[PDB]
Design a protein around this ligand. Structure first.
Ligand SMILES: CCc1ccccc1
Length: 161
């Protein structure tokens, strides 16, 4: 297991535009295109991201290229965020994957609400952090995925995957 295999499990792979769990146009391995309800706006974002007129459809190689970019940008964003970087750097490699996964799903904006969880993670109070992480819209809206990510934060193992 590694971050790519983990997010591939959690996000799936679809080669045509689909709506994500929040109703937003997406493609590939969880590549969010736009929050606009206009499918044409989503198709334009797709064409811009791929560099050709895709008509709403991409190849597996193209999906994997977006995924590489999206994972890279997620972790680099963690490092550029002064609140997240010290917590991330305090973690072991497996728990770092849980952090990348959560940021990939929620963005750094959705992560702004996790201040108290972040402190418990940096303190290595793992069971307490896991309880706190689950007191969230995130957990309630995607409980099976959040349970996997939380178990990864709690244990530092890949047991949930
Ligand atoms: C809130 C997700 C997270 C956890 C640890 C470090 C960075 C980001």
């Amino acid at each position: 297991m590694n971050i790519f295999e983990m997010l591939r499990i959690d996000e799936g792979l679809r080669l045509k535009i689909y709506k994500d769990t929040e109703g937003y146009y997406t493609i590939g391995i969880g590549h969010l295109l736009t929050k606009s309800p206009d499918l044409n706006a989503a198709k334009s974002e797709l064409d811009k991201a791929i560099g050709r007129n895709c008509n709403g459809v991409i190849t597996k190689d193209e999906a994997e290229k977006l995924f590489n970019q999206d994972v890279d940008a997620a972790v680099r964003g963690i490092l550029r965020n002064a609140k997240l970087k010290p917590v991330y750097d305090s973690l072991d490699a497996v728990r770092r994957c849980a952090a990348i996964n959560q940021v990939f799903q929620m963005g750094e904006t959705g992560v702004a609400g996790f201040t108290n969880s972040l402190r418990m993670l940096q303190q290595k109070r793992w069971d307490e952090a896991a309880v706190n992480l689950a007191k969230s819209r995130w957990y309630n809206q995607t409980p099976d995925r959040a349970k996997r990510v939380i178990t990864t934060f709690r244990t530092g193992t890949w047991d949930a995957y």
